Swiss-Prot record:
This is Endolysin. It is found in: Host cytoplasm. The lineage of its organism: Viruses, Duplodnaviria, Heunggongvirae, Uroviricota, Caudoviricetes. GO terms for molecular function: lysozyme activity. Its EC number is 3.2.1.17. PANTHER family: T4-TYPE LYSOZYME 1-RELATED (PTHR37406:SF1). Changing residue 11 to N: Loss of 84% of enzymatic activity. It holds the Pfam family Phage_lysozyme.
Amino acid sequence: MNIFEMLRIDEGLRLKIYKDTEGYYTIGIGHLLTKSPSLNAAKSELDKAIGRNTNGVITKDEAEKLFNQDVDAAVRGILRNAKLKPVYDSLDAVRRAALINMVFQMGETGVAGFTNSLAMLQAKRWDEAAVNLAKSRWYNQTPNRAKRVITTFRTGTWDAYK
Ligand SMILES: [Cl-]
Ligand SMILES: [Cl-]
């Protein structure tokens, strides 16, 4: 298992524009297009991202390509974030994958605001961090996914994904 496989499970794969859990236009493997409520605005963002007139549909290859870019960006975003970097540097490989997933879902800004959980993670207080992570809108809105990422942080294993 690895980050890509993990996010593919959490996000799924759709070849046509769809709305995410927040009702935002998305495509592929969790690639957010726009927070705007206009489909045309989304179709436009999509053609711009793919470099062709798509008409709201892409192929698997195109989806995988946005995916690669998106995971690379998340990683690089963590590494450039003064709050996130040190936490990421302190973790083992499995747990790093969990921090990446959260950033992919919520943006680095969102994650950087889990001040207290970050500190617990950094200090390697697994059970406490899990508890704190759960007192969040994140957990209440997407509880099954959240439980998976939280167990990952708690255990350091991929069991929640098996
Ligand atoms: Cl893009
Ligand atoms: Cl969920």
